[PDB]
Amino acid sequence: ADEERAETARLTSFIGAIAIGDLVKSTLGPKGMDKILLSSGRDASLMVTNDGATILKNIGVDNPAAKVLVDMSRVQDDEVGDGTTSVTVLAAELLREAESLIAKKIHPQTIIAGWREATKAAREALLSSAVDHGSDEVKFRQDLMNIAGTTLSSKLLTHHKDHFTKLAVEAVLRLKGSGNLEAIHIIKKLGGSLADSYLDEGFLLDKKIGVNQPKRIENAKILIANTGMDTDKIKIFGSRVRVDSTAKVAEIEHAEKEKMKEKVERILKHGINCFINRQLIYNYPEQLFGAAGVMAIEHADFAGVERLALVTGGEIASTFDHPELVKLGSCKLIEEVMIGEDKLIHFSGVALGEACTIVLRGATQQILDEAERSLHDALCVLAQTVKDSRTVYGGGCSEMLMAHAVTQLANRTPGKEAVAMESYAKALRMLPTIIADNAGYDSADLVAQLRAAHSEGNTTAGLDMREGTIGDMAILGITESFQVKRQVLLSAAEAAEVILRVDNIIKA
Amino acid sequence: GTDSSQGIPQLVSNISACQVIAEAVRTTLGPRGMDKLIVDGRGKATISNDGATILKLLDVVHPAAKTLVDIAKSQDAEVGDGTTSVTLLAAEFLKQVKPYVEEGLHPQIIIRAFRTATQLAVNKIKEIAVTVKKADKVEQRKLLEKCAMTALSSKLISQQKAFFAKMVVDAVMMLDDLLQLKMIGIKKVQGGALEDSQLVAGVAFKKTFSYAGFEMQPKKYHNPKIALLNVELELKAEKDNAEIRVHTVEDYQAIVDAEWNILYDKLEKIHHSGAKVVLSKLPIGDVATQYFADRDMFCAGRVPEEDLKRTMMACGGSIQTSVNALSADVLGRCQVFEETQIGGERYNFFTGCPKAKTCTFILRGGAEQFMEETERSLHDAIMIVRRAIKNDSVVAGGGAIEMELSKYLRDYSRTIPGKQQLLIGAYAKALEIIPRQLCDNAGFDATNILNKLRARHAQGGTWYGVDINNEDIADNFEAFVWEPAMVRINALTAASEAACLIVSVDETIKNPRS
Amino acid sequence: AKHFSGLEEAVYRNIQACKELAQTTRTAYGPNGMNKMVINHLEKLFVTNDAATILRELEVQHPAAKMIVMASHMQEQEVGDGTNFVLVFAGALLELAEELLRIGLSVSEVIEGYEIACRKAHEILPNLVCCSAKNLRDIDEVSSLLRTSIMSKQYGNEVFLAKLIAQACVSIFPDSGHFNVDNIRVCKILGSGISSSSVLHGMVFKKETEGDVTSVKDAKIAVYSCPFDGMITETKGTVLIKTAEELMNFSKGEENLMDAQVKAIADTGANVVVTGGKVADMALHYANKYNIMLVRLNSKWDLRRLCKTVGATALPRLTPPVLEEMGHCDSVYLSEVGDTQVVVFKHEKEDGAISTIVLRGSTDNLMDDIERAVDDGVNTFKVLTRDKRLVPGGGATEIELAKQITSYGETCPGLEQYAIKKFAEAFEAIPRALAENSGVKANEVISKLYAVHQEGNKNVGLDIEAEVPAVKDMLEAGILDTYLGKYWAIKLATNAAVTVLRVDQIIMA
Amino acid sequence: KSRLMGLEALKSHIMAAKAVANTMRTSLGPNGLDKMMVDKDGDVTVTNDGATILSMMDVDHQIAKLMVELSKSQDDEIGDGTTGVVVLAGALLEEAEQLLDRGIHPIRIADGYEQAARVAIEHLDKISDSVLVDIKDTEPLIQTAKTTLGSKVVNSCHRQMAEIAVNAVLTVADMERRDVDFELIKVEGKVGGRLEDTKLIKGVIVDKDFSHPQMPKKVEDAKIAILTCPFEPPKPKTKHKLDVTSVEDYKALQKYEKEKFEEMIQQIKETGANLAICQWGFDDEANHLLLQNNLPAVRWVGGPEIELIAIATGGRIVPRFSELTAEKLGFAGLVQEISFGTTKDKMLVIEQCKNSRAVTIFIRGGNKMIIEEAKRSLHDALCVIRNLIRDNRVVYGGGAAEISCALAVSQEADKCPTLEQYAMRAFADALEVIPMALSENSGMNPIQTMTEVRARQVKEMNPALGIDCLHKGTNDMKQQHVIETLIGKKQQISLATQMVRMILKIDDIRKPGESEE
């Protein structure tokens, strides 16, 4: 085993999150800079990445210390949202903070509580400028809206931001006591629409109608089927192998075309004109099912009728054999909506109900991917804004207030560890600093002044480092739920002091 | 082709090489004498107090190096003791002869002075040879307890000796009909009353395996019928593997149960064959051991084969290679089978055995690093305690005799020589190296002590010799430090021979070339 | 390289090659010899005294010396003491030419010097025969020559191997007026002492004696290198554990498949079977049933030694053996050959010519060093039978010849004048060898051996007496070589020398 | 190969001995700063535990050999004490250099280390002779499980663990037997629970449950049918498992395999039980029959667990289905399928108020690192607790014992005028390195920090109070409750002191170099 003593261990503890943190601290903070992922270990590629993990995971994380945060920061993002770029930089900050204190010959243990207690009183000072915005629903609306727009920010989203700040809050204002990811049904395809998306009434489904089947279905009572047919319908006699030679090899394909027909017996027994199932059928099968005259819909989505049954008040169930193992679903129409060149079989039983389908049309998946996460991130920060509607001033203004207090605290608070608390407080104003030059602005005065300035009570007035200007965090809308900010404080403060207390690393 | 070298460059290389490896053996022997943990290959690490073992284990690439192995290996077979000394000695001449070959002067005769004074060496020590048995006590066995106490304290235990010294004498008197080093063999027990050896003329067993029947399978027999089994039984017994089907139509629950009963039979093949205690050197199936517990025929799985061999020697049994007992002779018997946890784990005691020829100590060590040198101290006694029996004639230990033997020859270094006082002094120089090797490897100056001893020998004395604890002047006879007289003779010939042997060879041929 | 140019083969190679081969003898010759360990392609330590023994395993590149090793093997078969002498003698003979090479005397010139002088010396050798003795029977008297010939070839017991090989060589024979190549073979066996060695005339199989004992008086063998697992003409059986049921049929079949074997053995006839290969489980148990002696799992050693002594020949297959393949021995019996209980035959007049000296010790090299001895006790006794002439022990005859061949140089004059002077010098490295093993100068030996100036007895051998070089009478010491020994040891050492002394550079493409 | 001797070996032994004492010294105790350790596998292990570090190290030498060996005799019996025994062995070896460099032969000092190892363990003997019964010691058991759960930083509110270790030792390992039971204590746990989700299960929890909740959750006292027999695929060990290869085969086996299990699950209940524990479980087809036949039973029981539920419950052995009989059954005080508070952790308990031959501590945790965080911590607790529930002999830890030892040691060291006069005195010096390296970890200068305890020993001349071990600034052995079993501290030494001296007696080593392990 390879014994790594503290000299490089603390050093490697520092380099791991810093060498990734610099990449995400571009993206993170306000926006003067980002990460453009230039991708070759796996390929010839050029990528633009505001996502921490897309920066983290794609590039080699192989540093055992970088393992921690790349593992730990993702969870923080997987938990409250947008925690990748956060837990990474903030601990990478502390790694710099530790490094000096390390290079100052200081016990990591002495540094632990110095930060760890400073983590509290900062989270406390974070709770101060955390300002509950639940007052009315319009307040809670615009709180969530300011908060939804907060996490979406510093990321590339084309038409996404303004629609989901409606939708995410829409998903919130329907569930009332939480937000809905259980409701919003994300449907992705090629629609030719740039980012353009909408709340989908009922849920659309993608299939070409053809062969003999008339395309539109009117007055459609769906027969909900959790078990459809793949190609051959599965039952006692469903499988055979007759092949003794190369002819039978071509003749066995012909034998299973019989099995498509016996599927009609099951559905013709149920009697409902509209049979909606999970398992798809093909176009040559469409001959046999469409000539049957009953309408058997293939690949009718579970979460789709799960939308219906919730909003339609009906029951979507599991284990479908005979018609009544699932309570019959009621739609107004099974229709084909044509979006551009697309042909989309569209089930409308309800409109914008407490379960919504969301049709995401884009020419690129990565933007639709980073749009989902920021949506996935916001609703979580919105669902906690349902819980804690404090929206704490962001954009580094929170860092300042905490940096000012904890510094004031370290002054009095310890007799020794005033080292680390201010060092902690120093790491606070760091994240502000890296992005002001990114607008060209001077962080020093800012972190000196505007901290003390708004830590003397301007706290709404804060950092616009997109403009490199001093502006109101509430009015600029730069602010977010007190949790996520404290949540992105929790892990990063914890992420650093782990490898901080790590003085040796075995390597096999 | 073939490579060869005659003359001194060979002989210098000869004497040089023989000095090289026997070096490693020098430092090793004593109570404080260094133990040699040798690592051959990689995961292979070996501690020895005896060189002959590591002589075989260490690489000897020379006629000079190889000839060192067997010579102490001879002494290893002689007393079971004294390898390192014989390894120390044969090459001791070489540095002593080194000026003589570096002066270039070696009449091939000069080897003969080795044997020559070795005569007087094997003489005086058998001339000063003294029976410990006949004179000491009447029983002679409390002498053996004296020899126990001294040879139990010869390696580790000064404190545990007296408690074990009766037990050593117990086994020595028991073991001496046919003596075999394993047949006193100690069975470790840890967690009972520590620092206590418990001798049973029968045999305790390390391994017994039962669960579901761990403690609910009968552990006691007032006579065991013991199938000594190298057999392996598994979840189920023999069934046809080729062209067999499970899950078929009617065979699903039939063949599983058919596998069951054949196992019961092959497990019962042991039971109804007159096996009460089933000692199975090889694995027993999980539910198979349950069936042993089901049939009330005691099962011991993965028994140590020596426990099976200690069985046949104590219990009148023999190892059965098949489950069904071949005979009642291979069936082991005792008049007691007791399974008693000392320290809290199951041991199979075969005691009250028909032969009961393999003695077993039940020994409790104080700790991890401490425990073994006790167990070594136990076997050390029984060797030289029985060797106090073996050779009645005994000389003071601790190199006591070799001291004056230096004088006696350095008398002849004075007395006879036309020349060979060199030879005679070189020979006599080889004598006291060991107590010098002993006291100094402890870290106490032997030269001073040895000289004072010989200074005390000078007035008059023979048995004046180092007691090795503080390793200083004493009388090993009076100190009760003994090895028999012949034991020195046993070393005197062999080591003084190899000197003669390697030196008469100035020319070493190797046919493979190189 | 074995290919050379640059006069090395002439003025260098030979004198280098000789002392390489030699200067074993220098410490290996005389009243004793100092053993020299040999390792083979098999790694092990083989101590050597006889010249041809250390050189047998020594593998030489020397184009020079390959002539001379044969001469030792020639000398060995002939007499057996003096093979040492032969190497160290030619050690003196050749090198003296280097001076005559510096002095400028040509090749054949000085060669004619040693030649006509070794002709002159061979003339004197019968004159320098000092007394004589022999008995075609007596152990003790014959032992002394067999003692003193193996002296050079043994440092060990001189009298004990004297008495054994004397017994052996003699008592294997009705006469020992005749003596042959193998009249004695050896079962090398450890245990007890090396002087526990015993002379048992017959073929010893130190191998197992198995089968039920059937004959004692009938030792006649049908000798087989054929294993008996069932190996026989119609079905050649082996031992196959491959399956259990096939093993069941083996035990059944083998009893019968072994049946037609020891049958055909005793058909062509024998009650004793020499099986150079294996014998199976039920094969031997059938021999227990068949009532024949199978001496099984023998060596090629115990196979050939019998095949040598009985004149028979091992069968790798089983066909009915002929009498050419079946030997008879006096009696087959179980007796201890130096305290070792196995089958030891008796051989005198049935087929015969094998004594077994059991070579003994605590190791095989002790049995190899006593192998050194009795081989000469074999060889010298033949010479002893060929000529009972006794000649001063090696080095006591030299001082005679040197004086004679000295003034013979001044009967020579002409370039062989000095070469014969050098041939008078060619004698005297032998006691030098003796004294150099003793470590002392022969320069004191030489003058004392010249002190009385006759040289019929006086010599300085290998002793603690020689520790201060001291004239002893090898003649009177019981050290008396045989004339042929004294004749042969001079002849080939002079013969192999002169032919390798005219060699030139090797020509190679 | 090669033979290295004396100073060569002397620099072969302490060298590999010196470094691993260092990785553990900043890992030492609660303030011992944890060590992230990563395999070649991409693994990560954050380890202040020497045994875990040793389990993490394959590092190569007789030392590294003996080190991975030495701690784990302390880690099972005593548990806590794993770290100090090694680091101090290095400190002893750290001394022997200079002390042989003073010209004192390595065996001239050797006894002196062991000779003075007497006073330390003898001084430890003096600390607390207290021995308390289970119901009394349970507080000192958890008061020590304050400390012995403390180092892994899973301790408070884990008095659950502390208390479940109180009974788990007592249940199987008696107080009077004083033969260690960590074998009949079943250490058990599952991911998805929580540290504060903690239980001591008296009998055997079998992971799988009855074939349905539609049949009762509860089997009464005993009636456990011990079974090796397929009601699901057997996978027999004599032949190989294969399934139906034909269409008519799924016809007949479906019809055949049902009615037999109908009969057999009835034949189980015919033989009788409310619980049939099957080595080879009920299939889903056999599940509905266990429902249909109206019998409760377990589906899956481990191949070993069919012995476990037999032995651990004391249930009289029923080998298989063919050996089914009424008088032989697995036993229970009761049988439940118990939700542990996180339905993710769900077991069917066969619980023993009759006889528990394997008592089951069932820890829970969000994941595996967290339950192992608890378990090895619970282990060392359970360890010391069992030691204490045997004999409650304790000692105030953190070296204030050894600071009190070392002074008394080095004093009594000087008393023997033999050269170990000095050599034993230097032994005592090593006794001070562990609280030292702890005071390093504590964030304090150990030099002055120990002299506080030294002064406190100059005050007390035994530990009562002390310095910090946890980092607070309230410096106490008693009130901070830094306390170890008096046993294992002596066992630390006995393991620590001799291995050095044993390596002292063995410097004669055939190696090309140290790395041969």
Side-chain angles (χ1 to χ4, degrees), chain D residues 465-497:
Chain D
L465 301 181
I467 51 170
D468 278 343
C469 296
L470 300 172
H471 66 288
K472 54 186 176 181
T474 299
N475 300 131
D476 287 332
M477 300 307 176
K478 181 180 179 180
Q479 294 299 101
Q480 185 171 357
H481 299 293
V482 176
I483 295 170
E484 183 63 14
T485 183
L486 192 151
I487 308 311
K489 296 287 282 188
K490 296 185 298 188
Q491 190 64 59
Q492 286 176 329
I493 297 170
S494 298
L495 298 175
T497 183

Side-chain angles (χ1 to χ4, degrees), chain B residues 107-127:
Chain B
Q108 297 291 99
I109 292 86
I110 290 195
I111 65 162
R112 298 179 184 175
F114 304 159
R115 303 294 182 87
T116 301
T118 302
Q119 300 170 336
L120 301 175
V122 301
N123 290 336
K124 173 59 168 60
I125 300 173
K126 298 309 289 185
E127 294 172 353

Side-chain angles (χ1 to χ4, degrees), chain D residues 236-401:
Chain D
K237 286 166 60 181
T238 294
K239 65 182 66 177
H240 59 285
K241 177 184 177 183
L242 292 177
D243 290 344
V244 292
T245 59
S246 178
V247 177
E248 295 85 357
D249 290 345
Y250 175 76
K251 294 184 175 75
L253 179 63
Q254 184 175 355
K255 303 293 183 291
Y256 171 79
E257 187 179 2
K258 184 172 180 289
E259 294 178 351
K260 298 302 181 182
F261 297 167
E262 293 177 350
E263 294 173 350
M264 290 178 68
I265 293 179
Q266 290 174 335
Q267 187 173 354
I268 294 168
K269 190 179 176 64
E270 180 181 1
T271 296
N274 286 337
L275 178 59
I277 51 155
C278 297
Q279 178 173 350
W280 293 344
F282 295 137
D283 185 69
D284 291 343
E285 181 277 332
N287 288 342
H288 184 62
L289 300 179
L290 186 68
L291 183 148
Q292 185 172 353
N293 299 132
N294 296 132
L295 175 65
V298 173
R299 302 176 65 187
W300 174 255
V301 173
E305 188 182 5
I306 203 66
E307 291 177 346
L308 179 65
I309 303 177
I311 186 67
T313 61
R316 181 56 181 164
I317 186 47
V318 179
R320 291 176 172 89
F321 179 82
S322 295
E323 293 302 321
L324 279 175
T325 184
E327 294 178 351
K328 296 178 178 177
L329 292 173
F331 292 155
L334 182 64
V335 168
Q336 302 172 337
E337 52 182 339
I338 53 180
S339 296
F340 292 92
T342 59
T343 58
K344 291 186 293 184
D345 297 348
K346 177 64 172 173
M347 309 303 182
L348 188 149
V349 60
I350 298 145
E351 61 187 343
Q352 298 303 104
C353 297
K354 183 177 179 178
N355 189 29
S356 297
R357 296 183 184 173
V359 65
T360 300
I361 52 187
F362 182 74
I363 194 54
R364 292 187 292 281
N367 293 132
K368 53 177 290 181
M369 298 295 182
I370 297 187
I371 64 179
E372 184 65 15
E373 178 183 1
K375 285 184 292 186
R376 62 178 183 182
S377 179
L378 180 58
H379 183 62
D380 295 345
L382 185 74
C383 296
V384 178
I385 287 181
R386 187 191 58 77
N387 300 127
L388 298 178
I389 198 165
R390 297 183 299 102
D391 51 351
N392 194 29
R393 301 291 301 279
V394 292
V395 57
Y396 293 127

